[model samples]
Target chain A: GPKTLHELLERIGLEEHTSTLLLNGYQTLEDFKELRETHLNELNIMDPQHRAKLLTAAELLLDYDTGCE
Target chain B: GPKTLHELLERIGLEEHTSTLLLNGYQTLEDFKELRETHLNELNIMDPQHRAKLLTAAELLLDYDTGCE
Candidate 1:
């Protein structure tokens, strides 16, 4: 699941460093989704926990929107 | 014993950005341990080497703490 989360980020166009920071620091799938949706612009400038929060929000959005297909 | 593993991670957690940088950069136990045991907090934030050292330490610490019992 972790690797899958990483791959999804790459597919969404996040830089390697940004994605790595999000995944490694947050330890959650929602955070990764948020980083992807934010276009890696503001996310890159944010502190780790804030970034993680954004990612967590995104993850919740995904579930609300898609319900995991 | 080098501030115990959990203590070390807690120390690292002080600055979200720093923790993120460390976790995202390094990928080994030796590197992580070096960062934790060394004077990483004092390193220049802008320097790539300092970033590398911090990250390496995080990785090593994670490795050391993996499934710790």
Candidate 2:
């Protein structure tokens, strides 16, 4: 459903460093809609609160992925 | 008021480099609501197209910034 990573991030905005993650190479909701999984630690986000919130946002996207493998 | 920088950026949804600017210290729409004029070039957005879009997004905020000097 997301038209772009910018679109998805805009809808559920909170993470301040979201651009950091995307620019660094992680795919957007559209890509995730067809795939899954990785430790947040791998991303090196040290602020556990922001990391948790970011993870939650990504988890919410799984709903769109209902038809996925 | 425009609310937090994150909320404002969410609404505009154009610049992927937006967070980069904010985290680097540029204020948000709410912060600018009481002020005006500094030149987008000062923000150092490099891409011509993205820079233009970013400036346009910032300009739209000027509507809410109407009561300011």
Candidate 3:
């Protein structure tokens, strides 16, 4: 389970978006849940498949949070 | 023409979310063309009707641009 924001970004292969996302208030691993396809639009991240990849990462993280700190 | 960003936001009734949007790099009325339903989700603007409103507004703006500078 990816417990840190960097780990989460690394796991999703979205490390390139890390700087842009931080300026938009996506600072923590939990903040990933708030990401949306439209938000990526402003960042010029228009790939539909990559957008869905981030969406899926958030969903997976939610389920993995059941017994976490 | 709703030529300014404020004017466009005012027309769509999303002026309340303006500050959040600016930080996310949404800088102009033309930027509305890039807005999306999922983007509003990050601003906690979860109402489906409102989301559709923003989407429709973007569509309308695109059409409006066909005739102007």
Candidate 4:
């Protein structure tokens, strides 16, 4: 499932800041996955809450997706 | 006029999360159009901010319609 995609990103060390920025700034599932894949192997630091905020922002931004179904 | 369908959903009393869920889950102009036509007619009164939010959300979510032209 797509939720697993997020889990994979977390496993690979994706930071909250980058995640949040990606989600909030870009409103596409394809893009989220792409960043997650690329950043999974990278090193970074971000606040937990900030990561949550990014996820929240992504969720918020997903509201714009017309391919919901 | 430049707003998107998501902006239209916000114009009604729909919460941001709810708006997101609907858009993210449903993904269709027909669903949104039905919602707007029903909700708009029924809304005898609403908070000014809520009204605006719903309108904005709706605009953003409704992208499938070719009739707008």
Candidate 5:
């Protein structure tokens, strides 16, 4: 239930992985909000677990976006 | 013995791994030149061989930079 890119990424933790999101063209909350699971597949980065963690974290934000938080 | 960033990467021959170089705060010849084997290990990338190959290639650039050509 984060409102800003930094806030969401702060929740995500791990600056190394967070830097990766910025590297891969995802720098804003809206950028993440529009993301698909396939996008993670396309990255093919190290640690699918971490990316999966990002996906789950991002989805949690949707509940907030939908006014459920 | 590559002269430029593009030349060095072209010689390295892999865009995704090369892009990781930039992501890891390496944007120039000096950046790669200053790198150590431990840095590669710290990356913990998918393929050790590929990072090893990049390490070898970066070493070659030293010959070029040192006027061995």
Candidate 6:
């Protein structure tokens, strides 16, 4: 079973962004799997590095959840 | 300021497989950035989960190094 998105973020070295993501209501792996560039646009986070990390992390989570190896 | 592939693997919770990767000469982030499915196929690592994690982590490191995000 996939762990929480927060745990995933921590594993990916993005634990600092977990608070921001959770504040935006992205709590579960399901929620992270649903994230897209559009969703990140809404987060209004200014750092490209931050945005990239979040986007890639979400993409990985989605792949993991969907068994898309 | 990207770190080594070993560090990246550790951060992504794939530390257990790092030894396998290192044994195959994938020590630097550059080595990981160059990894492709063909490269993985040669490694003969049979676990889909392990392959997926390594591939995704490499993809993320490449994106980070190349300023793609």
How accurate locally, in lDDT, is each candidate?
Answer: 0.38, 0.44, 0.57, 0.37, 0.53, 0.63
- Across A1-69, the per-residue lDDT of candidate 6 in tens digits comes to 225767767655667878777899998867876766577788776555555556656654544353321
Which residue segments of model 4 deviate by more than 4 Å? A1-60, B1-31, B34-42, B64-69
What is the per-residue lDDT of model 5 for residues B1-69, given as tens digits with 9 covering 90 to 100? 344554455554545666677778767767776554577676555455455445544443332243311
User: Among these predicted structures, which one has the highest TM-score?
Assistant: 6
**lDDT per residue, candidate 4, B1-69, as tens digits?**
113344433423254534443544433445554344236435432444343334333433333233321
Residue B1 CA displacement from its true place in model 3, Å = 46
Instruction: Please give, for every candidate in the order listed, the TM-score of chain B alone compared with the true chain B.
Output: 0.35, 0.52, 0.72, 0.37, 0.69, 0.75
- lDDT of model 6 at position A43: 74
lDDT of 3 by residue, A1-69 (tens): 345666566655567777766777777757865666677787676755556556544443433332321
Candidate 6 — which residues are off by over 4 angstroms? A1-69, B66-69
Tell me the docking grade of candidate 6.
Answer: incorrect
Worst 10 residues of 5 chain A by lDDT: A60-69
Q: Candidate 5, clashing residue pairs? A: none
Task: Please tell me which predicted candidate would have the highest DockQ against the true structure.
Answer: 6
**Of the candidates shown, which would achieve the greatest lDDT relative to the real structure?**
6
Candidates ranked, most accurate by TM-score first:
6, 3, 5, 2, 4, 1
lDDT (Cα, 0-100) at A69 in candidate 3: 16
Q: Residue B62's C-alpha lDDT in candidate 6? A: 51
In candidate 6 the C-alpha lDDT for residue B33 amounts to: 62
Better of 3 and 4 by DockQ: 4
Q: How close to the true structure is residue A51 of candidate 4, measured as C-alpha lDDT? A: 37
* lDDT computed for candidate 5: 0.53
Model 1, A1-69: lDDT tens digits are 113444433422333454554545533445444444254354353444333333433432333222321
Off by over 4 Å in 3: A66-69, B1-69
Q: In each prediction, how many residue pairs overlap at the backbone (N, C-alpha, C within less than 3 A)?
A: 11, 0, 0, 33, 0, 0
